[PDB]
């Protein structure tokens, strides 16, 4: 029925409505609820390991490849303009103000934005997440608070590591394989950086959709209905949305500052 079809559409409207409402409530309860008995900092260490460190080889190799691609594209894009040696101010400006954090999102939100949702989803599905209450610990502070903290304090560091490896790979292909001159590269690069105005720009950009990624990437895991199909669908909702939001907030955050 078309009228009831639109009824279902509107029900989905109110559904995402109440969804992110409940999400912000969840986030509040998690970051500022109380202090639980069985918490600490070792939790944060274990998480930060599972979320950042394990997801580090991926972004290292990905930074390598995307950097040398950025080079092999800039060299050939610009040799048609003579200003070949200026490739440094490209491979280090695009890889540092916009593409750096965007790809770092789409990868972090790819792996650690998912195997983080499936983790606390599975937890909810084997009731493990529930027996915590019957014990007495608040899960939203023992199970998910270290997730959020491993998010906020990993993805920015990951973006930095990615940008570094990207620039270095771009140089290594440009210097050794393209043949452009050694010192000229870093020279034009440092002459065209504007630290507080591009580097810090990219870092605040990284942090904001670090927060946004590992916010949904954990909420979805907390909300998914407990069944092996439910989790299998939540760990896809949290890639759809974690990429949508990465790019959307990249766009807004770059309209705030060109």
């Amino acid at each position: 029925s078309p009228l009831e079809r639109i009824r279902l559409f509107g029900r989905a409207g109110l559904d995402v409505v109440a969804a992110l409402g409940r999400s912000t409530l969840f986030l509040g309860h998690a970051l500022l609820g109380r202090r639980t008995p069985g918490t600490g900092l070792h939790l944060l260490v274990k998480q930060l390991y599972s979320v950042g460190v394990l997801s580090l080889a991926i972004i290292v190799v990905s930074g390598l490849f995307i950097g040398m691609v950025l080079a092999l594209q800039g060299y050939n894009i610009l040799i048609s303009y003579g200003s070949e040696q200026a490739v440094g101010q490209m491979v280090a400006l695009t890889l540092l103000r916009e593409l750096g954090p965007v790809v770092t999102g789409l990868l972090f939100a790819g792996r650690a934005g998912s195997a983080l949702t499936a983790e606390i989803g599975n937890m909810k599905a084997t009731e493990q997440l529930s027996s915590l209450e019957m014990i007495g610990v608040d899960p939203l502070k023992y199970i998910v608070a270290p997730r959020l903290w491993a998010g906020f304090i990993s993805m920015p560091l990951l973006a930095a590591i990615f940008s570094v490896v990207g620039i270095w790979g771009g140089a290594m292909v440009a210097v050794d394989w393209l043949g452009v001159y050694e010192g000229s590269f870093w020279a034009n690069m440092q002459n065209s950086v504007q630290f507080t105005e591009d580097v810090l720009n990219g870092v605040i950009k990284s942090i904001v959709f670090a927060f946004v990624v590992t916010w949904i990437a954990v909420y979805q895991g907390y909300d998914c209905e407990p069944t092996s199909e439910g989790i299998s669908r939540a760990t896809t909702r949290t890639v759809v949305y974690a990429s949508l939001a990465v790019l959307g907030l990249d766009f807004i955050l770059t309209a705030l500052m060109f």
Partner: protein, 149 residues
Amino acid sequence: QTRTLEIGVGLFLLAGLLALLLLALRVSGLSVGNAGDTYKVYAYFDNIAGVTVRGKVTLAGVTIGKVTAVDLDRDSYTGRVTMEINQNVNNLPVDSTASILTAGLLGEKYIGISVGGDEDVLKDGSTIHDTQSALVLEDLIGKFLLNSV
């Protein structure tokens, strides 16, 4: 009725997100801390070929501001440029001249000013009287060696 509460908070957050349009939020040419008070001035040139808007009007090298707009006054068919001056710069006599320069060799044709000397200084919203138009690679070559041989 937790559903109602969730809906309310979600509407608050969607409002907060819509509060970030960034299509003329803080209309200005600079930040909100900087007053942006820059008084007007006009100037009458005969060719401003590379004095596009967003240039840099300067004096002795240091920037004094930027061009705001360029116009063709339909009476004399000359160029009239309207530009701005930082208020701290308020000490330019009227007999001073303005002329288009070129940053290095292929830098955008900015305009510099040469201070003349006259006790009265500025309405700062007035125009200039005398100038030297931008050099062009055509009439120069034409009068030096295209037609003067």
